[PDB]
């Protein structure tokens, strides 16, 4: 290796990383991160995401605690769980996966409803929202200490970025995580999620155990352990508004996407217009200078957040629709079939 | 004029390759090389010796003595202009900051515009 590479330390620095310095520097960093945002100067509404299943579970348990009875009970009372009991007192409520399914259903319904709402182009929604999947893999022969490294690598990344990350490491036991990621991506694509805007939002490690083997030594017998762990990953499909605000406004673009763009330009698989088309996302320098240009246009009030968002969304959707139509046409399908596919 | 207008000194006070009023003659070694090559080109083209100097790829320059005389006068005027402007700027710099650039005193790699290396 370089032998002069700068290796980072999160707790100490030559420049002075005492706690007061950390406070001041992180105040500066927070200020810069907040100022990096551009916000629309006119919106019609401030819709916020809510989870009906979670709200109903909360109210159900609050009623149980407040009245000592199930909602609707008039004679008997609530019976907490005891040792050996085979009945779940909260069996009527949905499970976590059921709540996730209901969330996906509600997201689909709201997406369909928004297509027939006036002024839908001037509504602020915020960070949270979209569909969520939770995928679990068990029997991984790795320990907490290594799994923490491999998951801290990928947390917060787009799914293809995470797959590229973990594939570059050439570690045999990371094949488990790679299999989980590949299977999750395939499942979401088959269910109809847009792989392009699926991110790894969080992870959870659950121990399962450790198999012990004797190790015979000079004066004692030891026990060497092989771990058994399970990993749960939370994938989230960002809504189109959040995707726009992330990629276009804050310039937080997947490196996999940027690499694909650069490879296309280098191989001349696209026209010369692609350079200006992809300028807002192509490279670090282009992203920085486009962010500067957008900031100046916003401060002169020539930039329009809602119009830019609409243009970005329309271009993305039209590209996807063209892909679908042309892949159908490549099969020799009839005009009636193609038309009916759009209903 | 009744109220004199003051020219801006920023062209003199801005030191970069994008400011000619300051980088026109910098570095002095390459300025000298440029002047020498201009003189050689003028002598080998506007004063032909009957042979191809081969200093550059050929050009279809005028050969009539009447045209050559006027070209020579133009080049002489350009030479005088460049020399006088360099002299004036050097005098102004000397009177202002006492800065003065002279000829190299010794045969050294830096005077040759090369890095000093083990070779």
């Amino acid at each position: 290796p370089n032998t002069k590479r700068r290796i980072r330390d999160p707790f100490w620095r030559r420049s002075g990383w005492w706690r007061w310095r950390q406070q001041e520097v992180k105040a500066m960093n927070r200020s810069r991160a907040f100022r990096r945002h551009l916000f629309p100067r006119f919106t019609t509404e401030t819709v916020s995401f809510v989870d009906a299943a979670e709200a109903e579970a909360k109210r159900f348990k609050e009623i149980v605690a407040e009245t000592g009875r199930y909602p609707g009970q008039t004679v008997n009372f609530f019976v907490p769980k005891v040792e050996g009991a085979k009945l779940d007192p909260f069996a009527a409520l949905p499970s976590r996966q059921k709540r996730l399914k209901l969330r996906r259903k509600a997201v689909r319904e709201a997406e369909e409803a928004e297509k027939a709402r006036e002024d839908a182009d001037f509504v602020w929604r915020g960070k949270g929202g979209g569909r969520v999947w939770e995928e679990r893999k068990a029997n991984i022969p790795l320990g907490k200490k290594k799994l923490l490294l491999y998951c801290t690598i990928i947390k917060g990344l787009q799914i293809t970025d995470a797959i590229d990350w973990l594939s570059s490491l050439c570690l045999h036991r990371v094949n488990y995580l790679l299999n989980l990621l590949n299977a999750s991506r395939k499942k979401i694509h088959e269910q109809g999620g847009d792989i392009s805007r699926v991110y790894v939002e969080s992870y959870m490690l659950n121990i399962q155990g450790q198999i012990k083997r004797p190790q015979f030594r000079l004066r004692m017998v030891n026990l060497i352990k092989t771990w058994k762990f399970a990993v749960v990953l939370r994938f989230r499909e960002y809504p189109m508004d959040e995707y726009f605000h992330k990629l276009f406004i804050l310039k937080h673009v997947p490196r996999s996407l940027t690499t694909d763009m650069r490879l296309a330009l280098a191989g001349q698989r696209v026209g010369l217009h692609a350079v200006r088309d992809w300028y807002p996302f192509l490279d670090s320098k282009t992203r920085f200078f486009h962010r500067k240009r957008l900031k100046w246009l916003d401060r002169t009030r020539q930039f329009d957040y809602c119009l830019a968002r609409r243009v970005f969304k329309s271009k993305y959707e039209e590209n996807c629709r063209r892909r679908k139509i042309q892949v159908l046409q490549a099969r020799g399908a009839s005009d009636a079939v193609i038309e009916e596919a759009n209903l | 004029l009744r109220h004199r207008v003051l020219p801006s000194s920023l062209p003199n006070r801005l030191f970069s390759v994008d400011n000619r009023e300051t980088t026109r003659f910098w570095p002095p070694p390459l300025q000298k090389e440029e002047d020498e090559r201009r003189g050689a080109f003028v002598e080998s083209c506007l004063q032909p010796s009957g042979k191809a100097s081969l200093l550059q790829p050929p050009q279809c320059l005028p050969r009539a003595p009447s045209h050559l005389a006027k070209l020579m006068e133009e080049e002489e005027r350009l030479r005088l202009y460049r020399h006088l402007k360099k002299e004036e700027r050097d005098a102004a710099t000397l009177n202002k900051f006492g800065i003065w650039a002279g000829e190299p005193i010794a045969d050294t790699p830096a005077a040759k515009m090369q890095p000093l290396v083990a070779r």
Partner: protein, 428 residues
Amino acid sequence: CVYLAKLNATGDLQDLSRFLIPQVEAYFPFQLCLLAHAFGSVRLQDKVLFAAIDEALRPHLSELPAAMLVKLTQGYAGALVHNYGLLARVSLLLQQRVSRAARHSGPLLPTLHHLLAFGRVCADLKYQDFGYLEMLSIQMQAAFRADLAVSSSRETFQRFSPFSVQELVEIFHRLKVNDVSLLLAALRHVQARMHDYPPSCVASIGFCTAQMLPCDASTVRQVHAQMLEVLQEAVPLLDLCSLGQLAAFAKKAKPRRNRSALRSSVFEAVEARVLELQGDGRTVFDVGRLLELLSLNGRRVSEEAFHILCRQAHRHHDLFEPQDFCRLARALARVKCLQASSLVNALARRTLRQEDEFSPRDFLSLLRSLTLAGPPDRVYAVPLKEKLRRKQVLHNYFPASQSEQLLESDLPPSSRQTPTLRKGRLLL
């Protein structure tokens, strides 16, 4: 930048151009026009900035309001950047808008005031556009006709004012364009409604008209006579500039009766009034011409007035032309043949500094007058002779009618370039 220009922070304004340059193409056209006006107001030349501003405004010029066009052109005039490419386009645009003719932006269609402002800009930049001046003359003649046609005394001067008339006449005088019809119409309007003309306007109009036109014409002579009567009447209200213009006009005129007595009385009144303006250290005027008029045809200036005028002449040296130098030296030489040694020394030093500005004849006559008005100090006399000598060689100039090296003892004793040591202190 506009605030800094208004505050006179010339150095800071000059420094900020570095960051202004890469942002001109991003500003609004009215912002660029205000920037140009601000730079012109302090008389600071920044040719790179002005060129960039012109390139940026190229596609937007046609749609700019008349006031913003006037601001841009006034900035260029104040900076003395002779962008005739811009002046021609602005003149064509104004002519087209007037032909079509016949609150944050401002109207596209100009007014007589905007036309006169652009004409004054053209005079400052020495842009002699005869077509534009023909348009302006036609419009002004129509305006004068309509003003005379007006009858109820409340709509008079609705479209212009005596100051506007003065500005027009000054424009034509400065550009040396002899529009006889326009000048005669202006003089006729002045005669018709002179009771409404301020005395300063009367003085300026008389000066310009007498310098431009012959006084033998019947109408010109009559109007000039009446204007001189009114100006001699209003002398007590006039300032130094108006007094000097009146003195020049009263002598350049050709009256019917009492030609000499009129000039003598005018000069006497001007002398009486000058003493009352001793402390006026703000007004700008031609001290040299006033002194020359007072000392001419054997007339001898009053000692007090001469002292006051030579004292006040020091302020104007930074504004002097070669002709102003020559005229002041002539006046001093004539008056001696009183002497202002300090003024002569200052003139000699400044002409030695500005030797290159002078033609052979101008320099020769100036040196002759400097010597005749009481020779300056040798420190200026010797190098001045050397400069005259060099100029004569270079220009091969030798009139029909026509020393040593400097010594350390001739250097001023206020400085300490001699090795001598003196008793005393240097109070810091």
